[PDB]
């Protein structure tokens, strides 16, 4: 096995070594990375100092890059450093789930990285589903949720997304964007969402990553949510990353029902 896979927690995150991301990967390297990604939900690379062009080329080996602008590279979004009601789930989200087809993956690379501050976290939403009790699993299997984003996108997704490559059921509760559960009263929706969001962010479902210059994070948005840092606003250090995302398919629930657009680029550049 040419690519070393070093898991970072019991059920999410792995650091990969033995691949040079500045050059085209051969088919075996692509397969190994994709397999590690499906198994560990987010994979990380260290000391991969890339140009935007190389970042796009790497991304294109795994899917179709989506189109904070970077000059000459419409696939690349700038993540630059340059009041809130706080609950345990605040800030946790899955990228652009207000859209009908949320991007299935994102690739984020660190260019200007503080000595400390600015860690990112991910949570395993396949595990979160499996760790619901059986009656709660059967219950959420049949529920739909409305995801909204206003810069206006509104989409009805299954609360349980069936992963198109692994068949796993995912608790698809994207906390920044999921606003209500369809067909239940407002208080029922509020109480159930708080229950599921508390559950989805159990520490034992998460992994935390301390960036360094040249680091790369590549995650499966069909099975995760993530948490951008806020501790970095307390420090003078600059922080600059760049992101690509891969065009996704329309989610389906355990009943085979596809998501449904309700109303509706800006969420691709921001989330």
- Token couple for 106: 């994102």
Angle made by CA atoms 228, 229, 230, in degrees to the nearest 5: 125
Active-site residue, 226 included: yes
Rounded Cα–Cα distance for residues 261 and 99 (Å): 8
Q: Which of 63, 214, 229, 254 binds its own copies (CB under 8 A)?
A: 229
Residue 271 as a binder of Mg ion (CB under 5 A): the answer is yes
φ/ψ of 43, rounded to 5, equals -120, 150
Which one from 11, 41, 93, 239 is the annotated catalytic residue? 93
| Chain centre distance of CA 36 | 15
Do residues 222 and 166 touch, judged by C-beta distance below 8 A? no
Residue 94 C-beta: closest distance to Mg ion, Å: 8
Token pair listed for 1: 């096995």
Side-chain-side CA neighbours of 137 within 13 Å: the count stands at: 15
Contact range with Mg ion by CB under 5 A, out of 87-95, 159-167, 174-182, 239-247: 87-95
Would you say 249 and 222 are in contact if contact means Cβ atoms under 8 Å apart? no
Binding mask 91-120 for Mg ion (x = CB under 5 A): ----x-------------------------
The site map against its own copies for 63-102 (x = CB under 8 A) is -----------------------xxx--------------
CA dist 216 and 209 (Å) reads 10
Interacting partner of 23 out of its own copies, Mg ion, none (Cβ under 5 to 8 A depending on kind) = none
How far is it, in rounded angstroms, from Cα 72 to Cα 247? 20
271 is in an annotated binding site: yes
Burial label, 241 (beta-carbon count in 10 A; 0-12, 13-18, 19+): buried
In contact, 266 and 152? CB cutoff 8 Å: no
Select from its own copies, Mg ion, none the partner in contact with residue 75, using the beta carbon and a kind-dependent cut-off of 5 to 8 Å: none
* 231 catalytic per annotation: no
State the binding partner of 203 from its own copies, Mg ion, none, CB within 5 to 8 A by kind: its own copies
CB distance 214 to 49 below 8 Å: yes
Q: Which does 17 bind (CB under 5 to 8 A by kind): its own copies, Mg ion, none?
A: none
Least distance CB 200 / its own copies (angstroms)? 11
Task: Establish if 232 lies at the interface with its own copies (CB under 8 A).
Answer: yes
Nearer to its own copies (CB atom), residue 24 or residue 87: 87
Q: Which two tokens stand for residue 246?
A: 């891969």
| Minimal distance, residue 22 CB to Mg ion, in Å | 25
9 binds its own copies (CB under 8 A): yes
Position of tokens 């989330």?
271
Q: What are phi and psi of 169, to 5 degrees?
A: -85, 135
Active site residue 17: no
Catalytic residues: 93, 95, 226, 243
Binding site for its own copies (CB under 8 A): 6-11, 86-88, 115-117, 119, 121, 198-199, 201-204, 208, 210, 227, 229-232, 234-235
Provide the annotated binding site for Mg(2+).
Answer: 93, 95, 226, 271
Binding site for Mg ion (CB under 5 A): 95, 271
């Amino acid at each position: 096995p040419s690519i070393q896979v070093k898991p970072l927690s019991a059920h999410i995150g792995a650091e990969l070594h033995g691949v040079d991301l500045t050059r085209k990967l051969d088919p075996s390297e692509v397969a190994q990375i994709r397999a590690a990604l499906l198994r560990w939900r987010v994979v990380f690379f260290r000391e991969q100092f890339l140009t935007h062009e190389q970042h796009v080329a790497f991304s294109a080996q795994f899917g179709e890059p989506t189109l904070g602008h970077v000059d000459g590279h419409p696939e690349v979004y700038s993540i630059s450093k340059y009041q809130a009601l706080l609950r345990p789930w605040t800030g946790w989200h899955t990228d652009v789930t207000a859209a009908l087809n949320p991007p299935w993956a994102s690739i984020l690379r660190g260019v200007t990285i503080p000595p400390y501050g600015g860690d990112t976290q991910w949570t395993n939403l396949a595990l979160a589903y499996e760790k619901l009790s059986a009656p709660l699993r059967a219950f959420v299997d049949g529920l739909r949720g409305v995801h909204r984003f206003t810069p206006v996108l509104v989409t009805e997704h299954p609360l349980v997304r069936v992963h198109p490559e692994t068949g796993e059921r995912v608790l698809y509760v994207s906390p920044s964007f999921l606003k209500s559960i369809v067909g239940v009263t407002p208080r029922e929706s509020e109480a159930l969402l708080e229950l599921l969001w508390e559950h989805a962010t159990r520490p034992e479902f998460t992994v935390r990553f301390k960036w360094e210059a040249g680091s790369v994070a590549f995650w499966d948005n069909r099975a995760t949510a993530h948490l951008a840092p806020t501790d970095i606003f307390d420090l003078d250090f600059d922080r600059q990353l760049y992101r690509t995302t891969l065009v996704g398919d329309v989610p389906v629930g355990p009943d085979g029902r596809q998501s449904v657009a309700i109303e509706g680029a800006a969420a691709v550049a921001l989330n």
